[PDB]
Design a protein around this nucleic acid. Structure first.
Lengths: 90, 812
DNA sequence: AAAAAAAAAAAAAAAAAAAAAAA
DNA sequence: TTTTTTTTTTTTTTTTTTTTTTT
């Protein structure tokens, strides 16, 4: 029973949020050219070089939610008597 | 002709410098000599033009290139060596030179105005190289004009919202140079809103530490990236050092310590331990009392997980720590917590030398505890004395009581301590613990506790009868008695028949207090009744309708305690307390659980109900389908999106249940299709509601993927060998295809059909099931008007099924 | 002797190919 | 003519720690 609990605690360690996070050579400086500066220095034209406006702000601020630690130890014990441990995964 | 020679010289210098880093000083020297000769003869414009021409040839290079990485460093070293001359000339005395400040200013101006001609180029490599050159030159630039500064600020504020993350990192490296005690407001906007993690890391590392920007820097301790959560402990706080105890607020500091010593990753925990045990300890003078004083020790519970870490990195300090007889009768909170931690760490291991050469005897510890008890409750602040007594009691609870004199002394001490009425709840709890540790068997601690409770009750009764001159105790007496009895019942593990004293205390104290008007007395009585029902089965059977009525009709705490009691009763006993002659039926309890699940006004009650129901389903108790369906629906519900604890509990309880036993997976598969049916209806009403949070509910394709993940026979933990033959996921797909004729919208149909080619198809599977699936897929492909992606997915599924069936047909 | 550049491994997650609508 | 989303698939870069290298 201990091996199964350890396996479930190790495998399900990164998926505690749920929701959508359930998934487990040499440049020659002597050669001169003309089209080089034209291809380097030019206008953007059609190809956009900026990110969309919707992908600029986020309300979640890319922060982790409050952790409550749901492991096998918490679910094995009782409620009003944490000393006893019911028989599960067996 | 001189221009050709200048170009040849500079090109030879660049060709010799792009090789290796060895010799990047003679190149700077010859470049300075060439520039001096050019400005002396009168041809600096040609020199600048050719320098720009030869520098432009490194822009199209990719980031992962060393040839381009050498030229930028060469240019940076050139600028630095050209400015350091003027710096030294202005530093030592006042030496008049041959007009070099204007030449330097013009050179930097033209070089900046030339490199900025590709800041909006379509090639990302050119923009990266331009921004890298700007970042590496911004260190040595001196004073510039207002127009160039405005152009630079405009370009940076335009390129900070770039598409490529590397260009954004270079932009923040450029912007971290124009800060002062507009750039700060831009940097603090990227540390909280940028989608890339490297950009946030760069903005956090390259930001000034001030009273207005410190919260934004420390907020990254809960980032979604492990490197960002580790760098706040292994770089920022390390660089701050002793200023963490002066500038960081106490509560923010405690929250940071909690987040560091309780992370789900090993790297963050190791970094926090390295910061606490080594850097913060070495920043002082190697002492530990000052480190304990910097932390709050009292009014907190994190040092227990901190000092222990300090005992796992540096054991040598564990040897230079003593408690002589002189340091007594004058403890503080730090010394008491230190003694407790030392004793616990020495007992948890096998460090016996310190055990017999450091800690005193029991007869002396009893007197030392009685001294503080007398100072507190019979004669230094009160909180300090209570903390000292609590620490000493915690240390004595796990004490070696081989001798009889010390055991009797500690027993007398704990009796005289628990015989008081002013004692607090934690002190009562730790006294009950020490009393249990000071008993021979279970027939002695219970008798002593019952005797203490009866003595308190009789003393109150006698005082009332005596004051009556000049048969029911007061409410406070009942409260203290129930509080003392709860901790006693929490340590009894024997049938109730063998204990007649508890049977008398039942109808003498607990049972009259169950039906009391006061809410706290009622709650304590319900708790005691539950702790007693988890000992006898007849009392548990006879006491269930009252708990049901308490859950149905009662306050928040009453329903809380009653639900906990019911869950514990079902976990200890089982289906014995229900279904029988004179017993409460299961339908009423199921209805109560339904009502407490649908009630959104009590989130904690929802969390407790979900946890208890998952605990019951994980065992052999509660084998129903509608209850499991309601649980899965409550997990996938838009209403329950605000409750984080419920979601976090379901996300851990559902997979372990589905992967423990194949019967559980079959039970899940028998209802997942109907769950998806009821779920595809709530999404339509949410998308067509004009009143809201349309992004709260998950999209149906993610729900279908998660349901297919739970019905996969390859995720089982047993793997006997016949798992490749069992067909659990096929029945779910058949039921989904049958329900497919009930969906109204077309986008839902599309996102359901697209996520079909993901099941497990093998040869050891059944034949009739695969056949039936084939006719179902054929009917859906023919008698329907699909799009193109769904049609292609269905055709691929039908081709796979036909191949498997043709392969199975060639046999026997 | 002190500082800088190059190389191997661990850690940890962002990146990319195919196909059908959309502006 | 880009671009945009969804599904399915396979690397790529970073950071810490060691060796050489250049005075």
């Amino acid at each position: 029973e201990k091996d199964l609990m350890a396996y479930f605690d190790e495998n399900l360690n990164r998926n505690w949020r749920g929701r959508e996070h359930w998934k487990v050579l040499e440049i020659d400086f002597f050669k001169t050219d003309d089209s080089f500066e034209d291809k380097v220095f030019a206008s953007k034209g059609r190809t956009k070089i900026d990110m969309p406006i919707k992908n600029r702000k986020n309300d979640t601020h890319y922060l982790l939610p409050d952790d409550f630690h749901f492991s096998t130890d918490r679910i094995t014990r009782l409620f009003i008597k944490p000393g006893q441990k019911m028989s599960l995964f067996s | 002709d001189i221009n050709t020679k200048i170009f040849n010289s500079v090109a030879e210098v660049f060709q010799k410098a792009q090789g290796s880093y060895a010799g990047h000083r003679k190149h700077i020297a010859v470049l300075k000599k060439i520039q001096s000769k050019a400005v002396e003869q009168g041809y600096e414009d040609a020199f600048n033009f050719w320098f720009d021409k030869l520098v432009t040839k490194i822009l199209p290079l990719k980031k992962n290139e060393i040839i381009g990485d050498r030229i930028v460093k060469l240019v940076a070293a050139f600028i630095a060596s050209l400015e350091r001359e003027l710096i030294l000339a202005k530093k030592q005395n006042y030496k008049l030179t041959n007009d070099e400040e204007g030449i330097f200013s013009r050179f930097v101006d033209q070089f900046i105005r030339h490199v900025l001609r590709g800041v909006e180029s379509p090639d990302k490599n050119v923009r990266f190289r331009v921004l890298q050159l700007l970042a590496v030159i911004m260190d040595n630039i001196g004073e510039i004009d207002e127009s160039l500064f405005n152009l630079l600020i405009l370009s940076l504020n335009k390129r900070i919202y770039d598409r490529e993350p590397t260009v954004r990192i270079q932009a923040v490296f450029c912007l971290t140079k124009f800060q002062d005690e507009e750039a700060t407001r831009t940097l603090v906007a990227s540390i909280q809103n940028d989608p890339s993690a490297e950009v946030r890391r760069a903005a956090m590392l390259n930001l000034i530490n001030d009273n207005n920007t410190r919260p934004y820097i420390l907020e990254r301790a809960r980032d979604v990236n492990i490197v960002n959560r580790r760098l706040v402990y292994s770089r920022i706080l390390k660089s701050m050092g002793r200023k963490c105890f002066d500038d960081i607020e106490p509560h923010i500091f405690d929250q940071l310590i909690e987040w560091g010593l309780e992370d789900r990753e090993l790297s963050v925990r190791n970094a926090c331990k390295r910061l606490i045990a080594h850097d913060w300890l070495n920043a002082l003078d190697g002492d530990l009392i000052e480190l304990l004083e910097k932390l709050d020790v009292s009014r907190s519970s994190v040092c227990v997980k901190a000092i222990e870490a300090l005992f796992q990195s540096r054991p040598d300090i564990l040897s230079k720590i003593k408690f002589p007889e002189s340091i007594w009768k004058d403890f503080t909170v730090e010394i008491a917590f230190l003694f407790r931690a030392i004793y616990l760490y020495c007992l948890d291991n096998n460090i016996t030398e310190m055990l017999e050469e450091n800690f005193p005897e029991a007869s002396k510890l009893s007197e030392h505890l009685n001294h503080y008890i007398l100072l507190r409750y019979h004669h230094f602040d009160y909180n300090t004395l209570e903390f000292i007594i609590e620490q000493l009691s915690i240390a004595a609870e796990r004490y070696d009581y081989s001798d009889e004199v010390g055991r009797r002394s500690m027993l007398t001490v704990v009796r005289n301590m628990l015989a008081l009425t002013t004692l607090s709840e934690p002190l009562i709890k730790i006294g009950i613990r020490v009393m249990k540790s000071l008993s021979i068997n279970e027939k002695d601690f219970v008798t002593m506790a019952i005797e203490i409770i009866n003595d308190i009750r009789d003393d109150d009764i006698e005082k009332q009868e005596q004051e009556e001159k000049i048969k029911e105790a007061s409410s406070a007496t009942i409260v203290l008695c129930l509080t003392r009895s709860s901790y006693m019942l929490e340590l009894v593990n024997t049938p109730l028949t063998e204990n007649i004293l508890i049977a008398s205390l039942m109808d003498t104290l607990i049972t009259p207090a169950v039906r009391n008007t006061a809410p706290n007395i009622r709650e304590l009585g319900v708790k005691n009744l539950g702790l007693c029902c988890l000992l006898d089965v007849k009392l548990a059977i006879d006491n269930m309708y009252i708990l049901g009525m308490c859950v149905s009709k009662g306050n928040a705490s009453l329903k809380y305690i009653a639900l906990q009691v019911i869950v514990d009763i079902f976990s200890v006993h089982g289906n014995t307390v229900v279904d029988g002659e004179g017993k409460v039926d299961s339908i009423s309890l199921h209805k109560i659980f339904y009502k407490v699940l649908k009630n959104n006004g009590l989130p904690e009650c929802q969390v407790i109900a979900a946890e208890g129901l998952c605990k019951l389903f994980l065992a052999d108790v509660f084998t129903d389908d509608d209850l499991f369906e309601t649980l899965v629906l409550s997990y996938f519900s838009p209403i329950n999106s605000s409750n984080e604890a419920l979601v976090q509990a379901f996300a851990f309880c559902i997979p372990v249940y589905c992967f423990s036993h194949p019967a559980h997976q079959q039970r899940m598969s028998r209802t997942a299709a109907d769950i998806l049916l009821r779920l595809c209806v709530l999404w339509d009403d949410l998308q067509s509601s004009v009143i809201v949070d349309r992004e709260a509910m998950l999209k149906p394709n993610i729900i279908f993927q998660q349901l297919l993940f739970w019905t996969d026979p390859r995720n089982l933990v047993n793997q006997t060998g016949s798992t490749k033959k069992d067909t659990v996921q096929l029945t779910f797909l058949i039921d989904v295809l049958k329900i497919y004729a009930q969906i109204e919208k077309k986008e839902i149909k599309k996102m359901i059909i697209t996520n079909i080619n993901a099941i497990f198809l093998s040869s050891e599977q059944d034949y009739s099931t695969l056949k039936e699936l084939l006719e179902y897929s054929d009917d859906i492909a023919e008698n329907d008007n699909l799009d193109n992606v769904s049609k292609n997915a269905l055709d691929k599924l039908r081709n796979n099924l036909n191949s498997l069936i043709e392969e199975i047909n060639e046999r026997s």
